[PDB]
Amino acid sequence: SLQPPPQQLIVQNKTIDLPAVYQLNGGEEANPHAVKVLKELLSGKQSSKKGMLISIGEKGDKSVRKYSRQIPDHKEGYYLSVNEKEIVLAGNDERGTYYALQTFAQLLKDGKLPEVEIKDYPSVRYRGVVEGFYGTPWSHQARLSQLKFYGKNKMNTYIYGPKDDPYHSAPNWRLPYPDKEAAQLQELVAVANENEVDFVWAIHPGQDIKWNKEDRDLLLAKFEKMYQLGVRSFAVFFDDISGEGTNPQKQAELLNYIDEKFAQVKPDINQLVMCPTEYNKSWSNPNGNYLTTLGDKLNPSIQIMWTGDRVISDITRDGISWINERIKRPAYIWWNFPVSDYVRDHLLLGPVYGNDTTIAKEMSGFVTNPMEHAESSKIAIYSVASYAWNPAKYDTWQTWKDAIRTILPSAAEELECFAMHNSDLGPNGHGYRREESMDIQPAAERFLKAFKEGKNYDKADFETLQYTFERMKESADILLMNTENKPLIVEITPWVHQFKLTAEMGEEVLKMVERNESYFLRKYNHVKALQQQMFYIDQTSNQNPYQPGVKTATRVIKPLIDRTFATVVKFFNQKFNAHLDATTDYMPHKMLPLQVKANRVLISEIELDAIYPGNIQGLKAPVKFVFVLTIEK
Amino acid sequence: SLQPPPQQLIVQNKTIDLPAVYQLNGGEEANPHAVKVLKELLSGKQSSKKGMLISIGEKGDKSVRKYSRQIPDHKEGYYLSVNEKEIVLAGNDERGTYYALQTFAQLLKDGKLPEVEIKDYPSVRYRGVVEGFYGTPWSHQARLSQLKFYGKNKMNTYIYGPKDDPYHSAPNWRLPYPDKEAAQLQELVAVANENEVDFVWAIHPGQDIKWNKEDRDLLLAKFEKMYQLGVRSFAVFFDDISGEGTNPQKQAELLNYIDEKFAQVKPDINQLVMCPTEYNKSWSNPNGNYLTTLGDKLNPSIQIMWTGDRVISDITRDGISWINERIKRPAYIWWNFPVSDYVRDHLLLGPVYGNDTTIAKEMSGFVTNPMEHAESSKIAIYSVASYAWNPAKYDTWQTWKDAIRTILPSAAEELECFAMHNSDLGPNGHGYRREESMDIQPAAERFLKAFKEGNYDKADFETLQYTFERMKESADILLMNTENKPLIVEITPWVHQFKLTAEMGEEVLKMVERNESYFLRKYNHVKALQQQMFYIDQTSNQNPYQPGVKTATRVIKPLIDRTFATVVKFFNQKFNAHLDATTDYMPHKMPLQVKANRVLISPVEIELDAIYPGENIQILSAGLQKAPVKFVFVLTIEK
Numbered sequence A: 001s002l003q004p005p006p007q008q009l010i011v012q013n014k015t016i017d018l019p020a021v022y023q024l025n026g027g028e029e030a031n032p033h034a035v036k037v038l039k040e041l042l043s044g045k046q047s048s049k050k051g052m053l054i055s056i057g058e059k060g061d062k063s064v065r066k067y068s069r070q071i072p073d074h075k076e077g078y079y080l081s082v083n084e085k086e087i088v089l090a091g092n093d094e095r096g097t098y099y100a101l102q103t104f105a106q107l108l109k110d111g112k113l114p115e116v117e118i119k120d121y122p123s124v125r126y127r128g129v130v131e132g133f134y135g136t137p138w139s140h141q142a143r144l145s146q147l148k149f150y151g152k153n154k155m156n157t158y159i160y161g162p163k164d165d166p167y168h169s170a171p172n173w174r175l176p177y178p179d180k181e182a183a184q185l186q187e188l189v190a191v192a193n194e195n196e197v198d199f200v201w202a203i204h205p206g207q208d209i210k211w212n213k214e215d216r217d218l219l220l221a222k223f224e225k226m227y228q229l230g231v232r233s234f235a236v237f238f239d240d241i242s243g244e245g246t247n248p249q250k251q252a253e254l255l256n257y258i259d260e261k262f263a264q265v266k267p268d269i270n271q272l273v274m275c276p277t278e279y280n281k282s283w284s285n286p287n288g289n290y291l292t293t294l295g296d297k298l299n300p301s302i303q304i305m306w307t308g309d310r311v312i313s314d315i316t317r318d319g320i321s322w323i324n325e326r327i328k329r330p331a332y333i334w335w336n337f338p339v340s341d342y343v344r345d346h347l348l349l350g351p352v353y354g355n356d357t358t359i360a361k362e363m364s365g366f367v368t369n370p371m372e373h374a375e376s377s378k379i380a381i382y383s384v385a386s387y388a389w390n391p392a393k394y395d396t397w398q399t400w401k402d403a404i405r406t407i408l409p410s411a412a413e414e415l416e417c418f419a420m421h422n423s424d425l426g427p428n429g430h431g432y433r434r435e436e437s438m439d440i441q442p443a444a445e446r447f448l449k450a451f452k453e454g455k456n457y458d459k460a461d462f463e464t465l466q467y468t469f470e471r472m473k474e475s476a477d478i479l480l481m482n483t484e485n486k487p488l489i490v491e492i493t494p495w496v497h498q499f500k501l502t503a504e505m506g507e508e509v510l511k512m513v514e515r516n517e518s519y520f521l522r523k524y525n526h527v528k529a530l531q532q533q534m535f536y537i538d539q540t541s542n543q544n545p546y547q548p549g550v551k552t553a554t555r556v557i558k559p560l561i562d563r564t565f566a567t568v569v570k571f572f573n574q575k576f577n578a579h580l581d582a583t584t585d586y587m588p589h590k591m592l593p594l595q596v597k598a599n600r601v602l603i604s605e606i607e608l609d610a611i612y613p614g615n616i617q618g619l620k621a622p623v624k625f626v627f628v629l630t631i632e633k
Numbered sequence B: 001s002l003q004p005p006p007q008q009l010i011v012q013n014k015t016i017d018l019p020a021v022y023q024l025n026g027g028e029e030a031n032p033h034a035v036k037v038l039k040e041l042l043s044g045k046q047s048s049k050k051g052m053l054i055s056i057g058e059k060g061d062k063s064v065r066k067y068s069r070q071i072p073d074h075k076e077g078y079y080l081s082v083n084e085k086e087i088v089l090a091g092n093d094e095r096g097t098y099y100a101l102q103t104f105a106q107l108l109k110d111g112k113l114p115e116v117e118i119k120d121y122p123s124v125r126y127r128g129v130v131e132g133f134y135g136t137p138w139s140h141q142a143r144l145s146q147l148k149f150y151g152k153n154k155m156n157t158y159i160y161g162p163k164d165d166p167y168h169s170a171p172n173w174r175l176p177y178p179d180k181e182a183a184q185l186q187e188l189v190a191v192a193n194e195n196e197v198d199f200v201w202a203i204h205p206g207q208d209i210k211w212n213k214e215d216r217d218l219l220l221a222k223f224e225k226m227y228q229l230g231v232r233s234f235a236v237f238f239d240d241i242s243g244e245g246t247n248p249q250k251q252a253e254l255l256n257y258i259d260e261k262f263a264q265v266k267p268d269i270n271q272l273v274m275c276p277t278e279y280n281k282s283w284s285n286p287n288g289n290y291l292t293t294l295g296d297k298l299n300p301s302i303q304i305m306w307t308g309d310r311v312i313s314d315i316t317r318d319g320i321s322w323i324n325e326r327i328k329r330p331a332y333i334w335w336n337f338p339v340s341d342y343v344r345d346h347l348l349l350g351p352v353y354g355n356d357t358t359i360a361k362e363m364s365g366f367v368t369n370p371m372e373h374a375e376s377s378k379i380a381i382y383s384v385a386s387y388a389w390n391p392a393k394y395d396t397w398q399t400w401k402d403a404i405r406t407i408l409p410s411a412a413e414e415l416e417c418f419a420m421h422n423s424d425l426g427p428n429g430h431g432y433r434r435e436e437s438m439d440i441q442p443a444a445e446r447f448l449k450a451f452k453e454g455n456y457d458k459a460d461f462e463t464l465q466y467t468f469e470r471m472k473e474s475a476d477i478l479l480m481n482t483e484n485k486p487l488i489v490e491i492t493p494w495v496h497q498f499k500l501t502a503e504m505g506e507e508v509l510k511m512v513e514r515n516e517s518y519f520l521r522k523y524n525h526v527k528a529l530q531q532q533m534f535y536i537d538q539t540s541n542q543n544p545y546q547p548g549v550k551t552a553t554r555v556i557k558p559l560i561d562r563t564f565a566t567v568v569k570f571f572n573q574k575f576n577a578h579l580d581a582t583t584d585y586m587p588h589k590m591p592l593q594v595k596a597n598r599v600l601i602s603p604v605e606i607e608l609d610a611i612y613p614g615e616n617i618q619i620l621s622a623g624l625q626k627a628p629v630k631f632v633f634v635l636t637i638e639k
Ligand SMILES: CC(=O)N[C@H]1CN2CC[C@H](O)[C@@H]2[C@@H](O)[C@@H]1O
Pocket: A132, A133, A134, A163, A239, A240, A275, A279, A307, A311, A312, A334, A336, A339, A341, A342, A369
């Protein structure tokens, strides 16, 4: 198994022992990063001037002369060969040699190798991640982890642009990083270079940029300082701003100036990229001159970024054609998934899917905007790496599974379970949704429909729902305690607690469906308690100003549990002339459901659970009795 | 249902409405505290020269003098009568009137009273609580709540004596409380008074006391400061100290000096109590003269405390006679339960039992030394209140249940479930144990021995399953209970751990029940639950003596752990596998134990789970001076 999958692969039935004794050829001449990976793998093995031949080099090296016709004629291409006789690792270029080895490392299992021959190369030129979300920027240790991950997955591009980094956006875009941050970024560049990733430093000046000499030189002066820190690629982002910085001509002029006086003037600059203000079709004015002014005026080597037909979308053939025709070059894709900065109570841990797999030629680049949860975001990132490199062979589900087994081999099945029920976004103003819990959706829907209606439900559907809740709890508790990937566990823990709760609630509700009056009342009271605990988690974990709290299994599982609860409570009330409360979300205040957001109490007379100092949509007057009410808390 | 149960109760089969209109007689002259209760109960109702008569007062008061023949001739005794024509509430004295109303309040239900006649009084003169434990003394708000609870259950004695209050013990017993604390104590005393509790301020000066005039004077000066704060009863404790302070002759002289120059000089001093240095028979040096010296020299009015035949023990007739003959007066019992300050990883939430119910005449007082967990301690305190008032009718189990229902009416069943399996102490240096989980014990032992010997009863399996499910319901209901927040805050750590124990139980039973991969899923889940329990045990309740959180330790945990190991042995034999059968999660390798920052072999090589700055090793010792160690009987690291 290989990720990304090679363009061409021919395998035998045969396997070969990794050489105890071996002759290395091309060591001094090949990309040193690739030699480092190779030497890592042959540690504990003996080098010699006569032994199994291992040949490593770039096309043009003496070491790989015999194979020059075998090496694909593509940037980052390579040829790889394992047979009884020798091993070959030959890139079209230095990066190609590195990538050959990243594939070699995946072939190698328990000191054994398959007999194989591979011709490989990326279908999309630029592939990777833009850290370009709103919210807490990735930690330095997290960024270090990402860059190594990108290397292993042949992603060649990391665009640094955390919207909340004050040295990236307004107004301190004009200011050089302080010493500590500068040395961190310096180390990120070195580590990026070691793993063959272009560290692209972006800047986001358009909210308060003046179109005068002063700001122009401050911007170039900032680029110069970034250049002194080792940065060799650059971007200027004009997304999510208003005012004069939206001017397409000025933007074009500025990028051209950067290109002509900086990028075309330094010895060794690589990418120069901009993000447009009109960055998706729905935000683009068909009758305005923005995108055509940009396509016409931007120098042809400058990349232009695009998110698709909509603020969040998957890339279609009609979609990419539409933008390419306007900007006069293939779009450099900014894919807004799994970024969750607008649904911050959800984790998006589902598969990567929905992007046309036949349009490689039509895009210059493909980058994923991820979640503020760095490790969690690796599921999608690994998948994107696989998609951008070989889109024709992109396998949605198998790649998702491969990602998860890579990220957490010690508890892959458990993480699969968690992830599969943590993938939709819930309703949102962008209308973008993912499937979730699709395996159990038919059983759920049949179970529920029977019930409400008053027809008998299938025992098998009941057991499946039961099996699921059981598995959720084993998964939650094993993940909670996993020490192979702590940063991942730390990131997910609040959702994991909530996920266990949801499952326990489900179990108890299934018990309510199943024997006498008092058993039912024990179960019902247990459910109420479990709802309260969920509320507690939702009110104290992940309390950010936009979408605070912790939602999980929201698409299929929680609504099923909730609706089943209302239904059996209703029937118990008809049967025993009772008035048990059928409400499914715990709510300590009383009133058409109320919600509690941070220190606000809102209606989707109100009586709070206590006296608090009171505004209403100004009040510190004590208040217990009273569409949002804010209190002190 | 009345707690404490009255000495005499005659109930009719009639019920009376608490009158709309009532004319009150004796309210300007009766104990004001009692009046207050009584009018709080009559809010809603109207007063006037007409309607049903209610008579309140002490014997001798115009209001209730005609009932003298009904009023028991006992300190704190009372007579209460309810019938169609009138209500009588009549104390032998002011405290009796108060107590009469505490009984009245329990009779009153849904605005209705039964026709009854009660004649009541306590069988033991002093009854209450000594706050006398090691650890975090009770908070101020907790102490307020306690005094109100004593009022309600007829405990007349609160002895303040937290071992860790530096103004109570050494070094600063010589020093007056700072302003903040003094104001709080003064509040406490006021509240004590309003609830007919005697606030007894104790002092524990023995560890560093000099037998000269300067310390004698400072001790009296301190008592004088407490008197200015409103304290009217006092104690001197000479427990758990060494050196010159243990001299029985000098102790008696000092107590006699306090009596003669202070207690007999102030107008209104009530109790004067000492706790001895030999405070139990086992600790009492046979043929030594310590207790006889006290009994002979201490002024006859001074009380002497005693914790029974052993440091922790239940009081018996043989036992109380052996103390009384020596101290030449009836011992004042300091009962060491539910105090847990020497098993701080356990909560002791079981019934109060073991004390002879026939020996009321042989004791001057009976006080419980509780847990540092104030609200939790109310189960036992409520029960001791019931025992000390009416021993002859003391009912262990029904009183336990009654306490729980008074403490947490909204989730009494769930609290009982929690308490039932949180009552033993575990092995300890004092050898004192309590029963726990006795209901499921039979099914447990049968289940186990069918395995060890070589089938099991489908019914026992189900009993166990039922139990784990109840434990889970109760844990989750208790966590979210908002009727008694402070109680919940105290027990939460044990509640989490009790839930984990129950979950582990379900998963082990599923292991007892189908195919290879299902077994392994259950086994992996169990391993994770063991780790979670370790985590709670390493992060909650971290004190220096017995850190952690142990729960359901007598029957349930051992059952689960043995059932795990046994079926893992069977799986290993069956599938020729090598699953680890150990039941307590341990991150470090070689039975290892982790206490705070220590790693010790339960009395060749230890591999820690990481490199830590090592500090030292006791086996013989060495400073390690922060040297890094992963690889190496106790090791101390920087954790
Ligand atoms: C071009 C672009 O998508 N810009 C911002 C806005 N999008 C829309 C969806 C996210 O909020 C994402 C956010 O992370 C990005 O910084």
